[PDB]
Design a protein around this ligand. Structure first.
Ligand SMILES: COc1ccc(CC[C@H]2OC(=O)[C@@H]3CCCCN3C(=O)[C@@H](C3CCCCC3)c3cc(OC)c(c(OC)c3)OCCCOc3cccc2c3)cc1OC
Length: 118
């Protein structure tokens, strides 16, 4: 995957899994609508927006979600599906989030950017 971090620390690696139809990337503060699939890189735990058939909605760059999402979704076009490989620094770090996330877990997400508004 491509390193999309400012630090170039390989903390968020991006693979485009479907090229988007839109020209626009969302701006900081935009309300973004996504579908997603998330797991621990060793696949012990799984979560999807599809489990609830409900798009996941958040304000881009607010720190409402893990750093990897604010960084990753900021690079995406409407209709784009991205795979993100996320090192602990950009997820739950050395603290983790037990019981769901252990310390220094690598996460994997598929994110589909549906739409966004200013
Ligand atoms: C700035 O840094 C942070 C910001 C927010 C948080 C809180 C967790 C936050 O979840 C997330 O950001 C990511 C990406 C969005 C979708 C859910 N997220 C998860 O990691 C899942 C995770 C579940 C295990 C398998 C891997 C994926 C994931 C899913 C969960 O439920 C389905 C979950 C959860 O808690 C850790 C994690 O528990 C219930 C909480 C739900 O709802 C939300 C709602 C908004 C945000 C989240 C979860 C931690 C941060 O750093 C450690």
């Amino acid at each position: 995957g491509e390193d999309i971090t400012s630090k170039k620390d390989r903390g968020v690696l991006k693979i485009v899994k479907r090229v988007g139809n839109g020209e626009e990337t969302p701006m900081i503060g935009d309300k973004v609508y996504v579908h997603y699939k998330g797991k621990l890189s060793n696949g012990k735990k799984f979560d999807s927006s599809h489990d609830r058939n409900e798009p996941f909605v958040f304000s881009l760059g607010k720190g409402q979600v893990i750093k990897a999402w604010d960084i990753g979704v900021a690079t995406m076009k409407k209709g784009e599906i991205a795979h993100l490989l996320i090192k602990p620094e950009y997820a739950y770090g050395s603290a983790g989030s037990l019981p769901k996330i252990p310390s220094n877990a690598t996460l994997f997400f598929e994110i589909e950017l549906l739409d966004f508004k200013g």
